[PDB]
Write a protein that binds this ligand. Structure first.
Ligand SMILES: [Mg+2]
Lengths: 231, 53, 294, 342
């Protein structure tokens, strides 16, 4: 019947009572399920680890008192519980971990799978300096047209022609596609490399397994350099 | 270090707070410590036999 | 949804029914309204827009960019008050803040009592009613810095209930002496101690105590003798509840060190008759008290 | 005897996988292959009285549990195990569960183990203060003091002798001091006081956390912030307090901001390593908080209300003494909750 006021948390007198209480809850789970084996897909480097940001954890983990090393300790225990084998996990672990998943469920993604159009053409846009290029890639025999003109007519420099061919040379498909490139703005170099960038982005639809090789060659990276007003 | 006085006399210092009225409510430990007095002699004691031999 | 005139005529004013009828004849019932994510035309809350809010809407009769009255038909002829008072309660007092209606009425003793109760758990009533505070030293000290001499106010105060409890407190402030005294009063209450008193009027026997450079010689006195001691010691005795005392200070007479030395002497240099009796296993009789007993 | 029951489910489970696998096969087939041929069949077919039954029974069955339903609302162990086929070998997960079955039944056949020390049992099965012997204290290493070169001669009266370059603490006195300290913890627990267990040496957290849990107390294992007691409003005012009844259950009453800023002072402080926690001890003295501490031969006894002479460097000795104090608190708590029931 008699009532008294007491500290809410067992860690009240510690430096960060809120962080220590949360760590204790996770430590209890890691002790109760010490035996459960961990994922063997961890070697496969499963791409799932959506934990809340340091600032988001500071709302619940002591605010200003929260130290970076304390946040690092939270992630080492959240990941360890998360990496328990999915088949052998239980509700208790998942319930505790749910509160730490970055909230991104009410919203959706903005990416729709790219596909060939009604005529079998892959359309991509590329930009370099002030130049832009819109290319139409279709399966063919290596025919190229730049603004309706022959490649040797539009681009006089062989290095510009070699830049356009490089993405097709990476996937060894120089004679497997017809390119109808349209370019405007900047000069010959900007247009040739803008076409290069656009062909690389259009080739991924024909075989998405070659994106990694295209990225590694550097043709899918938009070149950011532009004329800078002297400051 | 000097033999401290204030750690073992918490009951007597607290009792002065309660008698004067500076402290309104008796602490929960107060009755327990009163029934179990601390040892406050802190003396050096002679010994007249080696317990081993 | 399209509603019959009957229903709409029981909620909306007659003047607005014609507009509702025309809108229900121009907007087809199967209109699929879309939400704009570029321009927010409507407010962030629901509103039928049938009533003019006295604050969130333009004041009727006031000139402004979208005033529909002719320039010779405005109805604001008095300009001594704010035209649009704040809505609702009439204030925007933040949650947890109080309107400073009255300023300069706080009692420093009550301010000390509230803070100490929250920080240490002492009773506010005892501090504000039972304790008497007396400043003993009030001076200005200074520190020489690269920027220049930085002055500070130093206050030494004694508090007591005149019934055995006395405390000494010190305080420093670079701003004003009142702040230094407040801190000293705060410190003094925290340092409150009980001092033994023989017959609640004097000390037990005589005391010869050395506190740093101060040599204190205090002698107990007969009832009605009064306080015949250094002025610093006098104030402490008043707060502590000592009525009869004689004494002399030798060597250093630094006020600060006399006050602290006196407090130390009253606690570390006295022994009650009861404590002497128990330690020695003997009975100690006050002959003067027995002479007047039954 | 009842295995068939499980077999009946597995049959459906296998059938369900078959239905799903070929539902995905038809998701690849172009509509031009199936749709026109399917529609043509209906154009060449005539519905019968029975066929129509399902023409509307399925329409409602699909207009009731698929369209006009609430998408949301406003085997217990290892329920996510994917069993392997009866012909296939055990999966890695099944082998783990197969081993766990063996561990419970067979793995402990052949002998029992007696008179062997298990470190965890000091924390989870501490003895009662009345059953403690000199042998038990000695087995825990409580008698092993510091080097005679590091002697703080104020501990002279606790010393039994010197042996192998260290001072041996008199366990007869340790037992008497421990019993006195244990009774104090029991009293404060039975009175409803706040008991704080402070220990900042590596490894002490586990013992400290369990001691607080079984006494409904508090602990600090990381760092004692200087001023936690004397400067409590600047350090601990922000943290949350709660009101509880005589059964230690949250009353749930919202607390006025006045009640949530007041200092919440411990009624009793237990310090495992006082030589490294002078700050806490001095604050306890200033705040009139009684304290208990393990006093090694180089430690000052007068700084604490109730010293316990004993080795403070070994986790076994500390956890042994902490366990005894923690169980004493538990008994006090159980006696307070019992008097409330009756
Ligand atoms: Mg030691």
């Amino acid at each position: 019947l008699p009532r008294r006021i007491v500290p809410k948390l067992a860690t009240f007198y510690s430096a960060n009572p809120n962080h220590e209480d949360r760590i204790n809850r996770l430590e209890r789970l890691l002790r109760k399920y010490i035996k459960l084996p961990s994922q063997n897909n961890n070697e496969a480097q499963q791409t799932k680890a959506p934990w809340i940001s340091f600032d988001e954890y500071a709302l619940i983990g002591g605010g200003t008192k929260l130290k970076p090393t304390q946040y690092t300790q939270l992630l080492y225990m959240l990941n360890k519980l998360h990496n328990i084998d999915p088949q052998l996990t239980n509700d208790e672990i998942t319930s505790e971990l749910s509160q730490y998943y970055k909230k991104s469920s009410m919203l959706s993604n903005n990416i729709k799978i790219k596909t060939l159009d009604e005529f079998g053409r892959s359309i991509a846009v590329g930009k370099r300096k002030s130049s832009t290029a819109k290319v139409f890639v279709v399966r063919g025999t290596g025919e190229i047209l730049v603004n309706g003109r022959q490649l040797n007519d539009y681009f006089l420099k062989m290095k510009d022609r070699e830049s356009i061919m490089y993405p097709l040379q990476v996937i060894e498909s120089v004679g497997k596609y017809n390119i109808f490139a349209t370019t405007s703005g900047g000069g010959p170099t900007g247009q040739a490399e803008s076409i290069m960038h656009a062909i690389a982005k259009a080739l991924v639809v024909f075989n998405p397994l070659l994106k990694s090789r295209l990225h590694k060659a550097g043709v899918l990276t938009r070149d950011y350099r532009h004329v800078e007003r002297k400051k | 270090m000097k033999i401290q006085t204030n750690a073992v006399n918490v009951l007597q210092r607290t009792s002065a707070y309660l008698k004067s009225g500076l402290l309104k409510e008796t602490p929960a430990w107060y009755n327990v410590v009163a029934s179990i007095p601390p040892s406050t002699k802190f003396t050096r004691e002679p010994r007249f036999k080696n317990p081993s031999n | 949804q399209h509603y019959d005139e009957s229903l709409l005529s029981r909620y909306y004013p007659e003047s607005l029914l014609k507009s509702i009828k025309l809108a229900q004849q121009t907007i087809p019932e199967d209109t699929k309204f879309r939400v704009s994510r570029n321009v927010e035309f409507a407010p962030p809350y629901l509103d039928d827009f049938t009533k003019i809010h006295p604050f969130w809407d333009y004041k009727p009769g006031m000139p402004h960019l979208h005033a529909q009255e002719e320039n010779n038909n405005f109805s604001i002829f008095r300009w001594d008050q704010v035209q649009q008072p704040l809505p609702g309660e009439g204030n925007i007092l933040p949650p947890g803040v109080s309107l400073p209606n009255d300023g300069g009425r706080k009692s420093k003793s009550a301010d000390v009592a509230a803070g100490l109760h929250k920080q240490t758990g002492v009773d506010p009533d005892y501090i504000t009613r039972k304790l008497t505070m007396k400043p003993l030293v009030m001076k200005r000290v200074s520190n020489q810095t690269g920027k220049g001499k930085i002055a500070s106010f130093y206050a030494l105060v004694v508090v007591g209930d005149k019934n055995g409890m006395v405390g000494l407190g010190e305080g420093k402030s670079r701003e004003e002496m009142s702040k230094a005294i407040f801190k000293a009063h705060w410190d003094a209450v925290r340092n409150l101690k009980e001092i033994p008193r023989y017959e609640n009027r004097t000390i037990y026997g005589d005391i010869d105590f050395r506190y740093h450079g101060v040599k204190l010689h205090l002698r107990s006195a007969k009832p009605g003798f009064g306080l015949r001691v250094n002025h610093v010691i006098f104030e402490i005795c008043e707060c502590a509840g000592i009525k009869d005392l004689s004494g002399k200070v030798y060597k250093s007479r630094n006020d600060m060190n006399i006050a602290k030395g006196t407090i130390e002497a009253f606690t570390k240099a006295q022994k009650t008759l009861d404590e002497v009796a128990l330690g020695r296993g003997k009975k100690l009789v006050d002959v003067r008290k027995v002479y007047y007993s039954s | 005897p009842n295995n068939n029951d499980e077999v009946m489910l597995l049959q459906q489970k296998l059938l369900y996988d078959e239905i799903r696998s070929e539902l995905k096969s038809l998701s690849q087939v172009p509509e031009d292959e199936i749709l026109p041929e399917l529609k043509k069949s209906l154009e060449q077919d005539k519905l019968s009285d029975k066929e129509q039954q399902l023409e509307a029974e399925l329409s409602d069955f699909f207009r009731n549990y698929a369209l006009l339903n609430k998408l949301f609302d406003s085997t217990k162990p290892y329920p996510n195990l994917i069993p392997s086929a009866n012909d296939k070998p055990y999966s890695s997960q099944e082998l783990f569960l197969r081993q766990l079955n063996h561990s419970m039944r067979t793995a402990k056949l052949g002998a029992t183990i007696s008179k062997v020390y298990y470190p965890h049992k000091d924390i989870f099965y501490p003895p009662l203060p009345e059953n403690i012997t000199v042998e038990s204290l000695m087995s825990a290493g409580v008698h092993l003091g510091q080097s005679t070169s590091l002697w703080r001669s104020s501990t002279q009266s606790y010393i039994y002798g010197e042996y192998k370059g260290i001072h041996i603490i008199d366990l007869n006195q340790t037992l008497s001091y421990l019993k006195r300290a244990a009774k104090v913890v029991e009293g404060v627990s039975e009175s409803g006081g706040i008991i704080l267990f402070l220990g900042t040496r590596q490894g002490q957290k586990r013992g400290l956390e369990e001691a607080a849990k079984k006494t409904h107390g508090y602990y600090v294992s990381t760092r004692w912030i200087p001023g936690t007691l004397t400067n409590s409003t600047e350090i601990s005012g922000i943290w949350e307090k709660q009101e509880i009844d005589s059964n230690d259950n949250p009353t749930e009453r919202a607390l006025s901001p006045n009640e949530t800023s007041k200092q919440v002072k411990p009624d009793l402080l237990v310090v495992l390593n006082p030589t490294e926690n002078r700050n806490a001890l001095l604050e306890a003295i200033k705040s009139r908080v009684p304290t208990i501490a393990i006093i090694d031969t180089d430690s000052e006894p007068s700084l604490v209300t109730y010293p316990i002479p004993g080795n403070d460097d070994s986790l076994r000795s500390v956890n042994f003494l902490l366990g005894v104090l923690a169980r004493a608190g538990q008994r006090g708590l159980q006696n307070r909750l019992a008097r409330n029931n009756e």
